[PDB]
Symmetry: C2
Subunit: 248 residues, 2 copies
């Protein structure tokens, strides 16, 4: 039970052997939109099961990651056109890797891609880890302006771990801030409640829309109400499915 | 799918609906022992599919985390006893959550559970995140002195991400240091090679045995030999198996 996972990814792109899942994002302060996060899984060569963490790790590798990011975008748009066509007012969050964020030719590739899609506006929100972009701050700035231009949105995920996390946002064009898992633990404790309240209040003072992930029970879901959260995500609401079939 | 994941876990502890996987940790310097890492899987109540990452996140919630860690440890101890009764010299690497790191009843419970199984000395390696060890240094000190007392060993995993990471080692009893994946990416670039290499050497300077994970292809194998890694791990060598059936003599 083993294999070169690089080669497996390279030969998965070669053959379009991937799938996309959709994990809805749920509005606590109104949004007409159907928001889903796009997640990626690998269709395994027949016997082999590539463990997810090892898969994701491999797919961050420079020059594999760009190709992969592009497959997701491309196919994300393809499906997104099939879907909205149904009259559906839908919006997809897509991940971008560190590599992609660095890749000067991305906004170009994306423009041409989006034309061929005749894709509705403000339907794509691009998502960047706070680490990738606290690091590549200038490339993230170029990219998020670039993205406004195309009538696209942008989000920082895993927000609030870094030193002074509000600083990087003075420099970006992002509407959403998906808070880090670490803030959504042991919420039954006040200090953790309070910590999450303040974090969320400051994002609101900065006119960002907060997204709180990892809602794993009904209770936490209440605390996120009084905390001010704008959106939530998790398995208690819905897990990642092959279809954008959530009843909002 | 949909579900209260905290609920599910607490019933899974009820129905022992967990499953342990085992992933070999390969020696490069010729350690004869078998070494495996222990990994937790949830048996999904029929139809369900609880995403791993959400599973793991909830498995961290205080109160729940300690019990799950105990489930894991007791089951690791039984399978281990079984495996070694057939003549294998085998060590198991077992994760402790943060909640367990601050649980003052963890050590008396383990000492009991070890004596009950009559596991020989140096069979279990308890693995603590750098972040948890760093957040809770004083507790990690006590736990690791406690562990040595019980002829157990310890490892810091995800090591090297924090500022001055060697500082926390000055206060702990740990034989193994498992380096964060961050150091293993893009190893075709000489800078990344040189940084891996200087990390591993400082560890060797500090008389720690280094473990390098996320070995995903042959190319990085060679790099890791030359940098001096003591152990390595990744799907390129062997993925997680439901049983300890890996032939370490290839």
């Amino acid at each position: 039970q083993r294999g070169d996972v690089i080669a497996i990814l390279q030969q998965a792109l070669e053959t379009n052997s991937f799938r996309l899942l959709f994990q809805p994002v749920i509005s606590l302060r109104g949004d007409s939109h159907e928001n889903y996060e796009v997640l990626l899984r690998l269709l395994n060569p027949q016997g082999q099961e590539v463990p997810p963490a090892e898969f994701l790790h491999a797919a961050k590798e420079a020059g594999l990651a760009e190709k992969i990011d592009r497959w997701v975008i491309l196919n994300s748009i393809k499906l997104l056109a099939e879907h909205r066509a149904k009259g559906h007012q839908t919006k997809l969050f897509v991940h971008l890797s560190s590599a992609s964020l660095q890749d000067p030719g991305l906004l170009p590739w994306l423009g041409v891609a989006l034309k061929a899609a005749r894709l509705p506006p403000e339907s794509l929100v691009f998502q960047i880890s706070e680490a990738d972009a606290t690091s590549y701050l200038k490339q993230a700035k170029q990219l998020t302006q670039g993205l406004a231009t195309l009538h696209c949105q942008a989000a920082i995920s895993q927000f609030g771990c870094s030193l002074n996390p509000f600083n990087a946002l003075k420099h970006l064009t992002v509407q959403f801030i998906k808070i880090d898992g670490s803030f959504v633990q042991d919420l039954n404790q006040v200090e953790n409640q309070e910590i999450l309240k303040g974090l969320i209040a400051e994002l609101h003072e900065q006119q960002k829309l907060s997204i709180v992930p990892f809602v794993e029970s009904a209770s936490v879901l209440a605390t996120l109400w009084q905390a001010g959260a704008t959106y939530i995500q998790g398995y208690y609401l819905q897990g990642p499915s092959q279809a954008m079939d959530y009843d909002f």
